Design a protein around this ligand. Structure first.
Ligand SMILES: [Mg+2]
Ligand SMILES: [Mg+2]
Ligand SMILES: [Mg+2]
Ligand SMILES: [Mg+2]
Ligand SMILES: [Mg+2]
Ligand SMILES: [Mg+2]
Ligand SMILES: [Mg+2]
Ligand SMILES: [Mg+2]
Ligand SMILES: [Mg+2]
Ligand SMILES: [Mg+2]
Ligand SMILES: [Mg+2]
Ligand SMILES: [Mg+2]
Ligand SMILES: [Mg+2]
Ligand SMILES: [Mg+2]
Ligand SMILES: [Mg+2]
Ligand SMILES: [Mg+2]
Ligand SMILES: [Mg+2]
Ligand SMILES: [Mg+2]
Ligand SMILES: [Mg+2]
Ligand SMILES: [Mg+2]
Ligand SMILES: [Mg+2]
Ligand SMILES: [Mg+2]
Ligand SMILES: [Mg+2]
Ligand SMILES: [Mg+2]
Ligand SMILES: [Mg+2]
Ligand SMILES: [Mg+2]
Ligand SMILES: [Mg+2]
Lengths: 181, 258, 181, 71
RNA sequence: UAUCUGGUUGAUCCUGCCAGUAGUCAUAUGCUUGUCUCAAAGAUUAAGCCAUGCAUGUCUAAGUAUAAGCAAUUUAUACAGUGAAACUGCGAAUGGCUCAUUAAAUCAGUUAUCGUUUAUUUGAUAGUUUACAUGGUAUAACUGUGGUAAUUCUAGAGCUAAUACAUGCUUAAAAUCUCGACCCUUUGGAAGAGAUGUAUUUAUUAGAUAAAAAAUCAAUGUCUUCGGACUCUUUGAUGAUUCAUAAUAACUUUUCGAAUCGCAUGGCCUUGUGCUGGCGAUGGUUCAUUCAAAUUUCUGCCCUAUCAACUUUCGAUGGUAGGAUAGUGGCCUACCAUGGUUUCAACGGGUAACGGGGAAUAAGGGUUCGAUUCCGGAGAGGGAGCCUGAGAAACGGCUACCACAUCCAAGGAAGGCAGCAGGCGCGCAAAUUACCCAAUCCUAAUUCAGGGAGGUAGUGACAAUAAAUAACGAUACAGUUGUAAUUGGAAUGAGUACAAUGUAAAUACCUUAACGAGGAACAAUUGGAGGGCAAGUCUGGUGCCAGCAGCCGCGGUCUCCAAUAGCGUAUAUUGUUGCAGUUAAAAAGCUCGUAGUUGAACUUUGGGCCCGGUUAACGGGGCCUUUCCUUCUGGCUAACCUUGAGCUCUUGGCGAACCAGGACUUUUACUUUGAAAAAAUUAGAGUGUUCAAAGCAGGCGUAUUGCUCGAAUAUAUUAGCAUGGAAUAAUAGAAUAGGACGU
RNA sequence: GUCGACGUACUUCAUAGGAUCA
């Protein structure tokens, strides 16, 4: 038979789902960033845990260790590129200091809100899922899209979007036709 | 099993062929030929997955049946003909000649050569023995039987074979200070100079090899192939000249050239 | 039926092994060919690979070699007189390797007459005088020559090659086997 | 797994034969035609004796109790 | 366990205790189930039974066509285009499925074949064997006559081919070795007649050597200056061989050494259908290589000692000889001895035991799972046995027996789904008896044919990724908050659908004209908690109350909490590091004692110098200090003496050190480093798959032609191999000296 | 036979103590 295709889980249930403080923090995060369910928060927590565990393991090694240098440089480069880690904080120690909110900040929904295209984070999500937002020359319909530093400046309304210079949507031309009749 | 196998699963195929694991279920099984199965590159993989001339096996068969591909100066038509180390692949229509040489990463590399350098090959003398009627002969690593060798030629030496006549033009003795090429093991593809041969009667001989960067490594004698004297290779070497580069230095060079 | 596998035997420790698998063809055995004196009967056997073996069911002639004189002549086999493995072959007159047999001496005697001009053209005389020094032979061989039957040992395997070649007993060989006779 | 109960022993009688032989050799310490032919009562007795010997149900629980109580 | 909740009384605190609350994985099951990507399909320890269908055939210019086959044709009166049928060759031993048996067996790593077979591929390799080319010692297909109820049943007669079958020639010279008529008695010579390639069988011979010189006996050869002289004289490989190879004498129901085919018509001439000649296919001996096969060395397997002795009569251990094998071998036979394993656990038993790469958990040690995408082994209902072929103990090959079971005219015939679909095993249940060879590769005479291998789609939420079910306002009502079957015009995909893309053809995805939203009825779910109501019902009593509960009353036909396209229910889920043994598990009544485990100290320490490394500390080497392994041979040659020409060249000696090899030699444990440990998997680098899961892709210019980076790196226990150490723990040596050394 | 022993599986009884207050 054909060789296997690998698959993996991108989230894991927390050690204690029932902590009141954890519930309150999840509520705050979901409301602030307009997240649909707890699965998104669990996913981002899983990723951040993976990066921080890797940072711990690399820190454990002796300094100048070639594996330490190479892997730490790669991880810091990736974190700086994705925008979570600032330019001046290129040390594994500051990688270990990251928080979930930083990753939630880079989400395309939050960025679309911040740049002024939407009046609410929920409005940003609706715009994204309705094919109105384009990164560069490309339409993206995924709120969880993680925006890079280079790509943040190219977020705009899509050319095909009615808000981006295309023809009016079905409702607009329908009403215009009815008024004309 | 009740007889010889005729199928080769993709996962079980040699790694250095670099085959997609999801394209299909089976991989080309090299037919019997001059080179061993695990140390050979079938023509289908060479024409399709390396040169990208053919898009699929049927086009490769179409190419071969046209008699455009020559291996070692002879036309081959088998899609799974096991081309291997030091074999010359000539495509006259493209006016291209290739010599199959491992790169530093350990994979067969597309190395373009001039016609003059394509006129000959190098072979490691695997055996020297008297045949019937008292005629000495030499068997090389590619299974070529050459009669009436120069008497000084001994096992593990290198012979420069002219493809047109299949005769020895010159030979290199295996001695300290000679330039050698690694053809097996984790050091596959590296180039260096012999430093010393450890002999172990009834066991595998070991050879110490010093690279141009002064790094040293030990390899079993079966995996060593003498290719010339230091600084004077008898064949053109691929890019990198068989020098192993650390991951960090590779990163630096890649970033610089980009 | 006959099989050469080592599995059905007991282990070295004395354990009774279980049946690992059914019998395989590549470890077979075939019935013995009790070769005997008589009119020639040989039938082929198709063996592993394309090779062939010859089964000497009956035979009455063989090539025998006189080593001291370095000659080999073809001679009829009188019979089997003594065999080391088993006497039943001697009683039944079965031919196998190492069996001691009696053969006529006429070709060897005639050869010795011609070559040495002694008994047990000037060209002949010259050659005989040149070779006269080596004429003397063992007394034991000469006595058999007088009797007309020489003792010979079969060095071939009739059950495999279909031949019955041998060589004349001599020296310590002949003395020992005569003692055993 | 050597002598485990099978679903249909009666279908694989020959197999059981081998097992019995093995036992006879393994536990001995404690106790002490050519089908390839051009032309192909004691054998009937052989059939009956072997099939009966191989297949004898083990004497039942209630049967042990019955023999004890009859005694 | 942990946190949290609750109970421990006349109340409130502080302890302690008790009950409930954790987990993924696994099995079964319930409810729901819109979109994108991706992907799996075992299980009654029943390897239990199967209707029907399919799953292995194959032809190029190049083996055989007078098919009374088709079609062209006078580009053929031997054929020639295409070609059914059949012979011939090749394949069917690969692939696919399952885990029944199997406990030093398989398997993993690591060895060996100087112990053997090997179709095929690749490269070499055969002047030594009527020929303008031999037979039926012959037949198929086909014509024709027939039997049976029936089957991939076939009987008689008539024909005809080969790369089938069986035969059989044609080709240089020379050398050497035999047998030798004859002249002649010599130092003899010698016309002639024979034999030599390969294959098999046997016997014998060569396959040299650590280094130098002579005297004779016999045979007997070149030479000269007739005296004596006689040189350069031939031998490969391995650590190792009776190895490779060669030679001598014979032997063989004994082989092979082209009686084959396509395309094309060049060159010499004494002009003959004369001689010579190209490019290919297919065959063929032997050697080597390759795909392989067989056996094989060392180490490593769960539970069981209430299994302690086992194996040996009928082979168990070993020797000898033979038979057999492809070959080694008690594999088997005949005669011999009495051996082999074991408390360091043999032998016997259990195993819901195929082994491994791997999977889960864990902080680490460990514990469990691994039928299941790859490797290896075994099987095709159960035993037994074989033809063919290079390769089979084959089962989609055959034969018997055991058990099942189909047709039947009762005489007989045909069977093996643990291949793909699809059924039965219950009376309770679960993928389609679908499409295709378009990709992957495999088979064949072979580009083309074939392939339920494989791919494509369909089908229970297997396991995984992303992600809709509304967003922005105005008005109204109610105690600056909440509620709308209030209200405004903007957006959009679920779905429908021109078209195009996609695909072998389709479906789907991505696109997209045109439709597609206010209860946006285009009507999201699964669990838990808590109320309130009556001319109502039941039960009990220190009146009007309390408990239970309340779809039911006189007529008449509600709120909150958790997860979320997913949610619930049931079962299941020992201490080496590191436990305890006075008083609450567990120290045996005492002693001796075998195995096992463990076992006092001591042997070269210290000191003085030199070199080059790191960041004054740290490590790495050399010397000296009573301390160097020994010996021989060979290779190169330093330094050291010297002459001569200007620290460098050069003459002639001496040649240490170093390297190579032969001899010489206490053995391990431990530890360092280097190879090795398949791929997949794990960690991990790069990469805007629209993000992600993933995959190994991709990237940059572009009017024109194009250029270019990758597909890294790390891990792996024990065993085996190579290597540096000399601390710790062992082991051997000189004692009746049978001890060491020697110019 | 509502039998004995053992094995197996379950149920059950033993939890309050100190301080302050009335
Ligand atoms: Mg649109
Ligand atoms: Mg070796
Ligand atoms: Mg349901
Ligand atoms: Mg809906
Ligand atoms: Mg859609
Ligand atoms: Mg057992
Ligand atoms: Mg073993
Ligand atoms: Mg073939
Ligand atoms: Mg060949
Ligand atoms: Mg006939
Ligand atoms: Mg015996
Ligand atoms: Mg023997
Ligand atoms: Mg089992
Ligand atoms: Mg298991
Ligand atoms: Mg398994
Ligand atoms: Mg089988
Ligand atoms: Mg079955
Ligand atoms: Mg069978
Ligand atoms: Mg099969
Ligand atoms: Mg079948
Ligand atoms: Mg099936
Ligand atoms: Mg399938
Ligand atoms: Mg052909
Ligand atoms: Mg759909
Ligand atoms: Mg003791
Ligand atoms: Mg001590
Ligand atoms: Mg190791």
């Amino acid at each position: 038979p054909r060789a296997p295709r690998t698959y993996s889980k991108t989230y894991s249930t927390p050690k204690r789902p029932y902590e009141s403080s954890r519930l309150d923090a999840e509520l705050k995060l979901a409301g602030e960033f307009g997240l649909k369910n707890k699965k998104e928060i669990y996913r981002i927590s899983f990723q951040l845990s993976k990066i921080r565990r890797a940072a711990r393991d690399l820190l454990t090694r002796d300094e100048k260790d070639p594996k330490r240098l190479f892997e730490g440089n790669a991880l810091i480069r990736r974190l700086v590129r994705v925008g979570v880690l600032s330019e001046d904080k290129k040390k594994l120690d500051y990688v270990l200091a990251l928080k979930v909110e930083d990753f939630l900040e880079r989400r395309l929904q939050t960025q679309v809100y911040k740049l002024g295209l939407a009046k609410s984070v929920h409005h940003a999500r609706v715009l994204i899922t309705q094919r109105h937002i384009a990164v560069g020359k490309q339409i993206v319909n995924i709120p969880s899209f993680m925006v890079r530093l280079d790509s943040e400046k190219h977020i705009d309304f899509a050319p095909t979007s009615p808000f981006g210079g295309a023809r009016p949507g079905r409702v607009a031309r329908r009403n215009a036709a009815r008024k004309a009749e | 099993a009740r007889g010889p196998k005729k199928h080769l699963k993709r996962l079980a195929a040699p790694h250095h062929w670099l085959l997609d694991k999801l394209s299909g279920c089976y991989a080309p099984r090299p037919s019997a030929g001059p080179h061993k199965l695990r140390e050979s590159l079938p023509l289908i993989v060479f024409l399709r997955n390396r040169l990208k001339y053919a898009l699929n096996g049927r086009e490769v068969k179409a190419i071969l049946m046209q008699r455009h591909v020559k291996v070692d100066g002879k036309v081959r038509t088998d899609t799974t003909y096991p081309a291997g180390f030091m074999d010359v692949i000539t495509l006259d229509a493209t006016n291209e000649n290739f010599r199959l040489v491992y790169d530093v990463k350990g994979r067969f590399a597309v190395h373009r050569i001039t016609d003059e350098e394509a006129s000959y090959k190098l072979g490691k003398v695997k055996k020297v023995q008297l045949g019937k009627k008292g005629v000495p002969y030499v068997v090389t690593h590619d299974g070529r039987t050459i009669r009436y060798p120069d008497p000084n030629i001994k096992v593990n030496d290198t012979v420069k074979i002219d493809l047109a006549s299949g005769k020895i033009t010159d030979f290199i003795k295996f001695d300290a200070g000679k330039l050698v090429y690694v053809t097996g093991g984790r050091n596959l593809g590296r180039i260096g100079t012999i430093v010393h041969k450890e002999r172990h009667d009834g066991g595998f001989d070991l050879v110490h090899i010093k690279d141009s960067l002064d790094n040293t490594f030990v390899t079993r004698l079966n995996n060593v192939f003498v290719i010339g004297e230091q600084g004077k290779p008898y064949i053109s070497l691929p890019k990198g000249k068989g020098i192993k580069l650390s991951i960090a230095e590779e990163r630096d060079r890649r970033r610089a050239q980009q | 039926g006959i099989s050469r596998d080592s599995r059905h035997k007991r282990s070295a420790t004395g354990a009774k092994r279980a049946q690992f698998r059914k019998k395989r063809k590549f470890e077979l055995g075939r019935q013995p060919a009790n070769t005997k004196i008589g009119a020639k009967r040989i039938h082929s056997v198709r063996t592993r690979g394309g090779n062939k073996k010859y089964r000497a069911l009956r035979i009455e002639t063989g090539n025998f070699s006189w080593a001291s004189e370095g000659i080999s002549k073809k001679t009829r086999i009188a019979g089997v007189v003594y065999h080391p493995s088993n006497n039943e072959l001697v009683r039944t007159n079965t031919l196998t390797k190492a069996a001691i047999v009696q053969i006529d001496a006429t070709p060897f005697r005639q050869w010795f007459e011609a070559h040495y001009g002694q008994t047990l053209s000037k060209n002949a005389e010259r050659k005989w005088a040149a070779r006269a020094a080596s004429a003397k032979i063992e007394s034991s061989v000469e006595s058999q020559f007088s009797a007309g039957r020489l003792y010979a040992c079969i060095s071939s395997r009739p059950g495999q090659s279909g031949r019955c070649d041998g060589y004349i007993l001599e020296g310590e060989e002949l003395a020992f086997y005569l003692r055993r006779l | 797994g050597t002598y485990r109960k099978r679903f249909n022993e009666k279908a694989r009688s020959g197999h059981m034969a081998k097992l019995k032989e093995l036992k006879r050799i393994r536990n001995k310490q404690f106790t002490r035609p050519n089908a390839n032919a051009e032309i192909l009562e004691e054998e009937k007795k052989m059939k009956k004796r072997k099939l009966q010997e191989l297949f004898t149900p083990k004497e039942s629980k209630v049967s042990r109790l019955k023999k004890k109580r009859l005694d």
